[PDB]
mmCIF file of N, CA, C and O in Angstrom:
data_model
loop_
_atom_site.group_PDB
_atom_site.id
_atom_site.type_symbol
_atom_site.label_atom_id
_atom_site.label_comp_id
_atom_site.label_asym_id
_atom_site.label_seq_id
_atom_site.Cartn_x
_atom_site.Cartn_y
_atom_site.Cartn_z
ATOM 1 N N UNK A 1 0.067 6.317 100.557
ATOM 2 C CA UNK A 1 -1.232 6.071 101.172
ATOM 3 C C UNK A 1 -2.350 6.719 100.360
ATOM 4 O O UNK A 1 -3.119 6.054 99.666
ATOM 5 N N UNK A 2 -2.393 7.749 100.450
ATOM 6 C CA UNK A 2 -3.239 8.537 99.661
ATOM 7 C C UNK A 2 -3.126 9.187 98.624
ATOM 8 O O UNK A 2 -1.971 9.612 98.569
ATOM 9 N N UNK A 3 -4.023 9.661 97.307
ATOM 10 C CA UNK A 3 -3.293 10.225 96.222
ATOM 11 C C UNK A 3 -3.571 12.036 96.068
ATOM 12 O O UNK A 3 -4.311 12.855 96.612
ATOM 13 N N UNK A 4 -2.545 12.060 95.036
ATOM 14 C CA UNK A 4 -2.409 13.722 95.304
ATOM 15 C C UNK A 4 -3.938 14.595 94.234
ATOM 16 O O UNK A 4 -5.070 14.117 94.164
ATOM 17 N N UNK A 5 -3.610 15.521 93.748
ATOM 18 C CA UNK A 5 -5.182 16.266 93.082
ATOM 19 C C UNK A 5 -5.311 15.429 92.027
ATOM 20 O O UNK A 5 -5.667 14.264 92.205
ATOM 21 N N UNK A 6 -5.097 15.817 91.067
ATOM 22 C CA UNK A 6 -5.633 14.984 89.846
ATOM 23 C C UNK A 6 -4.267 14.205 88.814
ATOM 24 O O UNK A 6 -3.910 14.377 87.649
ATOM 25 N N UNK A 7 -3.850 13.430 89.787
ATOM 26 C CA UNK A 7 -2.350 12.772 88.856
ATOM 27 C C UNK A 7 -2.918 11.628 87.994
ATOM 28 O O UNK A 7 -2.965 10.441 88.317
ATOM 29 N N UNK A 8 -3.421 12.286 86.630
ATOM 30 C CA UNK A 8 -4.142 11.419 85.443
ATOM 31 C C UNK A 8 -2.716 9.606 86.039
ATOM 32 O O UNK A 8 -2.765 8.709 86.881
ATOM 33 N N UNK A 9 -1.230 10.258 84.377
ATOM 34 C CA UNK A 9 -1.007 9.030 84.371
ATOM 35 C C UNK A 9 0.774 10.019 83.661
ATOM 36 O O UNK A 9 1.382 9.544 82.703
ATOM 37 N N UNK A 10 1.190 11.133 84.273
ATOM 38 C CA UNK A 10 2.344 11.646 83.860
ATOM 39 C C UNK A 10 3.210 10.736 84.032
ATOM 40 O O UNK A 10 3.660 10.461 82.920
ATOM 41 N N UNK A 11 3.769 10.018 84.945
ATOM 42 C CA UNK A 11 5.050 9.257 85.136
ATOM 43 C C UNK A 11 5.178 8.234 83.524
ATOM 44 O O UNK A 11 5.982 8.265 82.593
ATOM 45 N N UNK A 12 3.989 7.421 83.805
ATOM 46 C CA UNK A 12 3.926 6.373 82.500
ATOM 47 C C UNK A 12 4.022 7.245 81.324
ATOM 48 O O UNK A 12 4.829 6.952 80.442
ATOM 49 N N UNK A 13 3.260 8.318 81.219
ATOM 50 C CA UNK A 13 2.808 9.343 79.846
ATOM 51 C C UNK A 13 4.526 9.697 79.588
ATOM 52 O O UNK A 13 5.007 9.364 78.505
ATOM 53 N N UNK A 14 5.327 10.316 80.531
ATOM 54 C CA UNK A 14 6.741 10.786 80.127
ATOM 55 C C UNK A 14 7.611 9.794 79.838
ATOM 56 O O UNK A 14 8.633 10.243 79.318
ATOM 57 N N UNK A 15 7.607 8.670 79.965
ATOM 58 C CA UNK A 15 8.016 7.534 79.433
ATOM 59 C C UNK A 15 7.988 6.855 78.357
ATOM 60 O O UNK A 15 9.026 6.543 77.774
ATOM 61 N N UNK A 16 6.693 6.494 77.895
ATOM 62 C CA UNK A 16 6.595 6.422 76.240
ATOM 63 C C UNK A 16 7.071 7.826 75.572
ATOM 64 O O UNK A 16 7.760 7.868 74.553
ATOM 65 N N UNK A 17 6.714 8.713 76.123
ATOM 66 C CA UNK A 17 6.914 10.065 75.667
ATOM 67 C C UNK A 17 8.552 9.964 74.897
ATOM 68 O O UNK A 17 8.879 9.792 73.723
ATOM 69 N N UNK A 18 9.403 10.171 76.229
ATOM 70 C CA UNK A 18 10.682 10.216 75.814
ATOM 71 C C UNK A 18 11.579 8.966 75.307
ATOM 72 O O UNK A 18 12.702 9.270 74.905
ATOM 73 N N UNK A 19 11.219 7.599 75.278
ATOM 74 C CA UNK A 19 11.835 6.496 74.393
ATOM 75 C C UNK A 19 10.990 7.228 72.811
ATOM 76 O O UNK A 19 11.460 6.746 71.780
ATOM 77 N N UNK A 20 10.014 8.136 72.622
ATOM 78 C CA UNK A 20 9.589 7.986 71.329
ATOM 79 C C UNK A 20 10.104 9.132 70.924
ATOM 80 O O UNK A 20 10.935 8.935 70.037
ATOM 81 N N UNK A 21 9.964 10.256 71.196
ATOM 82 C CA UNK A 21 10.778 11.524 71.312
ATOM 83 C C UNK A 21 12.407 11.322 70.680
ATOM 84 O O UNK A 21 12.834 11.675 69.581
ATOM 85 N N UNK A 22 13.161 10.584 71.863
ATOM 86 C CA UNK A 22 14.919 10.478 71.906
ATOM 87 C C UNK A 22 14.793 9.708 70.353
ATOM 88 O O UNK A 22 15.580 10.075 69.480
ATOM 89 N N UNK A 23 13.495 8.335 69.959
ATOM 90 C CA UNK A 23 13.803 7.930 69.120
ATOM 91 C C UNK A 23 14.284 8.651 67.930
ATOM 92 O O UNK A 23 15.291 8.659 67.223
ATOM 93 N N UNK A 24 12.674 9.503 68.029
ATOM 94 C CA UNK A 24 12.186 10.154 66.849
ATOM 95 C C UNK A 24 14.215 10.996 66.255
ATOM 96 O O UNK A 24 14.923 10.798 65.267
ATOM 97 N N UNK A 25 14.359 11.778 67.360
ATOM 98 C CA UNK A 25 15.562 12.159 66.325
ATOM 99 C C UNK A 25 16.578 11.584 66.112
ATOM 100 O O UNK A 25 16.978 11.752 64.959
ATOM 101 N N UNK A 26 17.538 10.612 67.076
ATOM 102 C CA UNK A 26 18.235 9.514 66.509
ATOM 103 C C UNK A 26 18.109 9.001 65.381
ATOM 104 O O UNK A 26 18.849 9.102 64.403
ATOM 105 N N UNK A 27 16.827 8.243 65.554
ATOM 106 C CA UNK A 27 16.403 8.012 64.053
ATOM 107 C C UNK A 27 16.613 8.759 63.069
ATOM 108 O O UNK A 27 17.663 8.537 62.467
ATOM 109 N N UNK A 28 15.798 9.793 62.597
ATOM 110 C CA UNK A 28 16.250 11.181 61.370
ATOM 111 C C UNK A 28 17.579 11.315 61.720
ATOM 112 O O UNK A 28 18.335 11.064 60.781
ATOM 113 N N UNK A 29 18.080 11.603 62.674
ATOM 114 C CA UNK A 29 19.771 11.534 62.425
ATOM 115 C C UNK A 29 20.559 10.701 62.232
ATOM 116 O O UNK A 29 21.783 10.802 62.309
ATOM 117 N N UNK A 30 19.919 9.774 61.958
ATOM 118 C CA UNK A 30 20.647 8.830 60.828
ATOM 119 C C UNK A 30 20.390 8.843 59.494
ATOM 120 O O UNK A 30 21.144 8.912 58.524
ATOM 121 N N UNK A 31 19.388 8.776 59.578
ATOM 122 C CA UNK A 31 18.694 8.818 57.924
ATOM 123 C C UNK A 31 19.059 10.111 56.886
ATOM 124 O O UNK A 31 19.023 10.269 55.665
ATOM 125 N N UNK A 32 19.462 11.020 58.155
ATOM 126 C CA UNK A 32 19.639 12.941 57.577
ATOM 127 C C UNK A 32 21.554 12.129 57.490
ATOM 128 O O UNK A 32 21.937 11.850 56.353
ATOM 129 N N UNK A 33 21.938 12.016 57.951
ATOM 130 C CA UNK A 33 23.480 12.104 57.839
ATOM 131 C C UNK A 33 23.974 10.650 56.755
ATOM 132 O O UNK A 33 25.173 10.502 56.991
ATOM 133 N N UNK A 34 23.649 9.864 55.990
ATOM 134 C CA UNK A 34 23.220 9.206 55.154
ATOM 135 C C UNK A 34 23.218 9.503 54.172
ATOM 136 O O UNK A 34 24.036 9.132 53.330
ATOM 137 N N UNK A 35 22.105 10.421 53.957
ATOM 138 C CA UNK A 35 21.659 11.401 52.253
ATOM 139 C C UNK A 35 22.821 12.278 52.365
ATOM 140 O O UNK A 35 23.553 12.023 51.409
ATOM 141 N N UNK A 36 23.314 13.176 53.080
ATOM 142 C CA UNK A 36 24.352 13.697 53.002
ATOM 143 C C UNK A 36 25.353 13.274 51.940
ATOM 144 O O UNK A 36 25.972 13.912 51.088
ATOM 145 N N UNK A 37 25.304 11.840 52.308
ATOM 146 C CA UNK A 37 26.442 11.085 51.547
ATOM 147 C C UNK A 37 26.433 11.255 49.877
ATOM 148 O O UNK A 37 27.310 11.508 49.050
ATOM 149 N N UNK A 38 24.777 10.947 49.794
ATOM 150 C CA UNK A 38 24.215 10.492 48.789
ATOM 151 C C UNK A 38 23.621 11.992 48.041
ATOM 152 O O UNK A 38 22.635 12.609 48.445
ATOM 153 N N UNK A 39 24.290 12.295 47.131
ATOM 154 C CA UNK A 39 24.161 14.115 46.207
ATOM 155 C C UNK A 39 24.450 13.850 44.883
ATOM 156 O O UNK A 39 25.490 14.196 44.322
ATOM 157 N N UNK A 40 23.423 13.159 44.314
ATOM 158 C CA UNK A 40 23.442 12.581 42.566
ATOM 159 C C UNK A 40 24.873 12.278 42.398
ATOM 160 O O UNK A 40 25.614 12.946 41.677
ATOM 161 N N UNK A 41 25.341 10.976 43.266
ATOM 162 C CA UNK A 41 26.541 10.537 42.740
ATOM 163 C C UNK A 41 26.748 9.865 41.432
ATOM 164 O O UNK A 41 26.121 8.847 41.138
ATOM 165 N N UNK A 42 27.728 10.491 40.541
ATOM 166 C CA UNK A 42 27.316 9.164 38.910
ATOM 167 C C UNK A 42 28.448 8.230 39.214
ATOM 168 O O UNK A 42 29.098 8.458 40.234
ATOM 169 N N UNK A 43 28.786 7.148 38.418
ATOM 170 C CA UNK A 43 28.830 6.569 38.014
ATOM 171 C C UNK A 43 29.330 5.543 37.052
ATOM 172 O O UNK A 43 29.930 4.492 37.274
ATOM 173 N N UNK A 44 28.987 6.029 36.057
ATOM 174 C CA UNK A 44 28.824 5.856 34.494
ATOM 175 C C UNK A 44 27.332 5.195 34.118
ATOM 176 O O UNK A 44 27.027 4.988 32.943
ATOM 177 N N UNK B 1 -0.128 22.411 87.354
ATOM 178 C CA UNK B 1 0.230 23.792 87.653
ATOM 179 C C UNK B 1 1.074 23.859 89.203
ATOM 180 O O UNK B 1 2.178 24.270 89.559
ATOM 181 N N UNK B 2 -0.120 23.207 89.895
ATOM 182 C CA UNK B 2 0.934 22.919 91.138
ATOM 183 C C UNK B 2 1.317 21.225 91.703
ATOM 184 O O UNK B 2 1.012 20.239 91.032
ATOM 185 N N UNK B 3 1.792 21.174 92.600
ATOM 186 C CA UNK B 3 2.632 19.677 92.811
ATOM 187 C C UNK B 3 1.777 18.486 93.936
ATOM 188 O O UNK B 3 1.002 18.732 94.860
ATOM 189 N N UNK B 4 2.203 17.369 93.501
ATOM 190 C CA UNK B 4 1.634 16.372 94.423
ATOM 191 C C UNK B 4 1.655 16.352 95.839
ATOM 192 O O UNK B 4 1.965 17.393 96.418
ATOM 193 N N UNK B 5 1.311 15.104 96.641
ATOM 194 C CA UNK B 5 1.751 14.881 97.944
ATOM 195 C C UNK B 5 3.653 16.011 97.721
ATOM 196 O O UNK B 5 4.128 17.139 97.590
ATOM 197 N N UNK B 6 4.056 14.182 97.859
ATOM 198 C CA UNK B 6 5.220 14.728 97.531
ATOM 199 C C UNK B 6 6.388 13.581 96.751
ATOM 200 O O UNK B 6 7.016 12.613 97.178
ATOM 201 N N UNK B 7 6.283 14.330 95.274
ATOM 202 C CA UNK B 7 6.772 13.752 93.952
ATOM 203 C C UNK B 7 7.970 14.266 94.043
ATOM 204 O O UNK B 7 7.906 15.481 93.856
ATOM 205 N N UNK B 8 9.049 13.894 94.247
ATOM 206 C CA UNK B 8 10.398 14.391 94.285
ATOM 207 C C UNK B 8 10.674 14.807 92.966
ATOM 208 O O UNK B 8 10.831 16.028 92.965
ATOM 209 N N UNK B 9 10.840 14.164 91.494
ATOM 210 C CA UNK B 9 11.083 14.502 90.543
ATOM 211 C C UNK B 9 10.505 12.780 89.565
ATOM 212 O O UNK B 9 11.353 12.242 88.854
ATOM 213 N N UNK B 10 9.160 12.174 89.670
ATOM 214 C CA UNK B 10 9.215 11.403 88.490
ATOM 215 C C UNK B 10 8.765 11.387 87.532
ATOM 216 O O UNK B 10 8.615 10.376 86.845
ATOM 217 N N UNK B 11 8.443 12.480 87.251
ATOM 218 C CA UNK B 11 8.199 13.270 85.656
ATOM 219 C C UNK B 11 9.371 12.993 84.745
ATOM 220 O O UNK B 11 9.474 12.137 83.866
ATOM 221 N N UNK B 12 10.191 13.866 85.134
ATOM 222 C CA UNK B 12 11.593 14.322 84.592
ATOM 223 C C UNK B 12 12.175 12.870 84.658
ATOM 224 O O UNK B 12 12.397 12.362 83.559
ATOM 225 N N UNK B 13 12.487 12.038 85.884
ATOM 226 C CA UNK B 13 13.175 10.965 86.045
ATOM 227 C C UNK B 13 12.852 10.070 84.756
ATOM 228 O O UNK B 13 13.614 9.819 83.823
ATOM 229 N N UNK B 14 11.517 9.648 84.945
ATOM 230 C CA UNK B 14 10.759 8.699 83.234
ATOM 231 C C UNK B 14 11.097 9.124 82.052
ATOM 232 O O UNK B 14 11.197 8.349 81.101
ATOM 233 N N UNK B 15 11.336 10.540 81.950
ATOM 234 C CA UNK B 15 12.029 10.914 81.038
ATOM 235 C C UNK B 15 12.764 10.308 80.464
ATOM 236 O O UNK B 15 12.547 9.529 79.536
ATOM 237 N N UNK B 16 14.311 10.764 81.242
ATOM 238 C CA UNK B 16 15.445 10.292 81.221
ATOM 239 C C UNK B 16 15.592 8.575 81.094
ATOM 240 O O UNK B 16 16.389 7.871 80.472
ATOM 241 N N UNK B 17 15.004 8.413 81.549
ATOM 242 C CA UNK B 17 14.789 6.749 82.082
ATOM 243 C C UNK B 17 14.775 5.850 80.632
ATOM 244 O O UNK B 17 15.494 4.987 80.129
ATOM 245 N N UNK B 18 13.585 6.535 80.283
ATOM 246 C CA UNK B 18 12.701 6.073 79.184
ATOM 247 C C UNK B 18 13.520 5.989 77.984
ATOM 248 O O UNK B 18 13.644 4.918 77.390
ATOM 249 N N UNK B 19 14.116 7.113 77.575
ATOM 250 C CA UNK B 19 14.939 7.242 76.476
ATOM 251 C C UNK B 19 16.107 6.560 76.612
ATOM 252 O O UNK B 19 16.612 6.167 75.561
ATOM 253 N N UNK B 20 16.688 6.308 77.668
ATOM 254 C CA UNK B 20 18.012 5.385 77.735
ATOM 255 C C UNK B 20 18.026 4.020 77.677
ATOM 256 O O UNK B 20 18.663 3.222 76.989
ATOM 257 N N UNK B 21 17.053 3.888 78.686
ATOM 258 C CA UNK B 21 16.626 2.322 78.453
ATOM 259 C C UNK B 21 15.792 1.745 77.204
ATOM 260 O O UNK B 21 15.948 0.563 76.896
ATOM 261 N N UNK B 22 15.096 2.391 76.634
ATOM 262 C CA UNK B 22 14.501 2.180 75.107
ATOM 263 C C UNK B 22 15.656 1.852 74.313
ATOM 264 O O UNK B 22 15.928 0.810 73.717
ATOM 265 N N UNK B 23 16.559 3.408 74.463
ATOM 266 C CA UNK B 23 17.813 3.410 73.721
ATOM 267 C C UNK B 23 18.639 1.788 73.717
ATOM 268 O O UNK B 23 19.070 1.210 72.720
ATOM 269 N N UNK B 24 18.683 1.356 75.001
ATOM 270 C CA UNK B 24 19.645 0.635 75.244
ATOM 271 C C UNK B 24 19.351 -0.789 74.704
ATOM 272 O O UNK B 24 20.197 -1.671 74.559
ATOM 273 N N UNK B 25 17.515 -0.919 74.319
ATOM 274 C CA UNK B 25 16.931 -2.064 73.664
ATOM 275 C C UNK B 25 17.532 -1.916 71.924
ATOM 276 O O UNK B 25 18.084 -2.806 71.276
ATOM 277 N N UNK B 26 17.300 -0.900 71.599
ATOM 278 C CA UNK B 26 17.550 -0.617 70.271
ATOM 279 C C UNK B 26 18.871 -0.748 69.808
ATOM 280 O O UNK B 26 19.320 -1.596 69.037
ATOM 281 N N UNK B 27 19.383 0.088 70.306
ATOM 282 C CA UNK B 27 20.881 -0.421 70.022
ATOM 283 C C UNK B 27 21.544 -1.704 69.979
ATOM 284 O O UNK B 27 21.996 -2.277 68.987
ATOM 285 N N UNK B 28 21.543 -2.119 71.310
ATOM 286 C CA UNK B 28 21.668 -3.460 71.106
ATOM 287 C C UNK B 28 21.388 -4.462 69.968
ATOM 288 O O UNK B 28 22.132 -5.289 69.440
ATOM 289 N N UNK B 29 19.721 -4.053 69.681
ATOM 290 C CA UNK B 29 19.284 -5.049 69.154
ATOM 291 C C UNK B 29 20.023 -5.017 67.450
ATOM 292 O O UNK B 29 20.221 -5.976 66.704
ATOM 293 N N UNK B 30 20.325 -3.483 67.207
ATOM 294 C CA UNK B 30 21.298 -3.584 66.118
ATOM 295 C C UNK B 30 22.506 -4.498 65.867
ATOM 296 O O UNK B 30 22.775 -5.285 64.959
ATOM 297 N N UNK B 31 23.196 -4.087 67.085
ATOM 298 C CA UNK B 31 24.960 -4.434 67.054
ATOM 299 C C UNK B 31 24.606 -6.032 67.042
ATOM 300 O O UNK B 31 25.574 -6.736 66.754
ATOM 301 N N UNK B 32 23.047 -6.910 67.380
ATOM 302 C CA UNK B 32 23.291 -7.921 68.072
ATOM 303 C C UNK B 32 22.946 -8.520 66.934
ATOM 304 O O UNK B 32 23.538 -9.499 66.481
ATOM 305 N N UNK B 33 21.929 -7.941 66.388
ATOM 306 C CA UNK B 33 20.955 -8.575 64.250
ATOM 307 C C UNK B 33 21.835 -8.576 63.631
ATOM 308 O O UNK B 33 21.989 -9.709 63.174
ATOM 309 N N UNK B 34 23.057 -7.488 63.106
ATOM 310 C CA UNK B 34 24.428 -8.250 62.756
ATOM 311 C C UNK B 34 24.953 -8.800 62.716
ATOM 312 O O UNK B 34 25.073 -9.647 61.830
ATOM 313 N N UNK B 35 25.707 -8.620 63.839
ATOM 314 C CA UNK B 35 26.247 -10.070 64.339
ATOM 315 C C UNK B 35 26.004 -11.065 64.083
ATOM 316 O O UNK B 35 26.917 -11.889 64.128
ATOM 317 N N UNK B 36 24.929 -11.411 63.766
ATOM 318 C CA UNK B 36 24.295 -12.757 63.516
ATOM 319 C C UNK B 36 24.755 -12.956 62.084
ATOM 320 O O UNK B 36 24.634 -14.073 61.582
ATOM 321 N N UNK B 37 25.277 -11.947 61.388
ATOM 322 C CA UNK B 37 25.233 -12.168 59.621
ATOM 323 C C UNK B 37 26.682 -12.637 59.707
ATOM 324 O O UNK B 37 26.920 -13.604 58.984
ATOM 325 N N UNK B 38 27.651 -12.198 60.387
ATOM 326 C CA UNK B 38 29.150 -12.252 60.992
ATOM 327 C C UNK B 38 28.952 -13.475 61.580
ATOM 328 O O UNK B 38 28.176 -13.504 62.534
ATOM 329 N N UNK B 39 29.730 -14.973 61.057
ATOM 330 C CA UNK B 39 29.595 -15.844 61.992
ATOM 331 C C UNK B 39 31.238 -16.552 61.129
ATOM 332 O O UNK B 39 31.144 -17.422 60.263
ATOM 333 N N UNK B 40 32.363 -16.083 61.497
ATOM 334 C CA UNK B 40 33.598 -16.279 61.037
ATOM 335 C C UNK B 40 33.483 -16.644 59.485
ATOM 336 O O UNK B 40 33.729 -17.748 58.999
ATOM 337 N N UNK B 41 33.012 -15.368 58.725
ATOM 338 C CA UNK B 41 33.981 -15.730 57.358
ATOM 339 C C UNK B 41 34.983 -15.548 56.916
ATOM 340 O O UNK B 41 35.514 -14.447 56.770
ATOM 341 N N UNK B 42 35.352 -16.443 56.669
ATOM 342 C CA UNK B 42 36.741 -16.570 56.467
ATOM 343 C C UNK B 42 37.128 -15.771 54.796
ATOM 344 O O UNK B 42 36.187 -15.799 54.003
ATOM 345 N N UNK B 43 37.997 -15.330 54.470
ATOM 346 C CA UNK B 43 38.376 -14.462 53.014
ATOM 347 C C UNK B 43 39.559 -14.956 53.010
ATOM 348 O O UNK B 43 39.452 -14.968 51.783
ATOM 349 N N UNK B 44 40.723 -15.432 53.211
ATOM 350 C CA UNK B 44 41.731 -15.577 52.408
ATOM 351 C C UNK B 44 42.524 -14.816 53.704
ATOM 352 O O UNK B 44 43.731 -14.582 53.639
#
């Protein structure tokens, strides 16, 4: 019915928040465990 | 600092929410853009 003191827009805000967040290191933890692989391998 | 009417927990909940279900777009959409390259080749 009525709203509480000043609730800007947290519910929506923690939402993009954490799909971009969880991304953010999934992501680098892939990209970090990858190079791992990769340590001036030769060749010939 | 202090709390709404009364917000049980959907701060924290969007959180959680957010990152799984994002997660669950992304992933997918990996295993699924593959797949598409996989369409029975055959090798011998």
């Amino acid at each position: 019915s009525t709203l509480p003191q000043h609730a800007r827009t947290p519910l929506i805000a923690a939402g993009v928040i954490g799909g971009l967040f969880i991304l953010v290191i999934v992501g680098l933890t892939f990209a970090v465990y990858v190079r791992r692989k990769s340590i001036k391998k030769k060749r010939a």
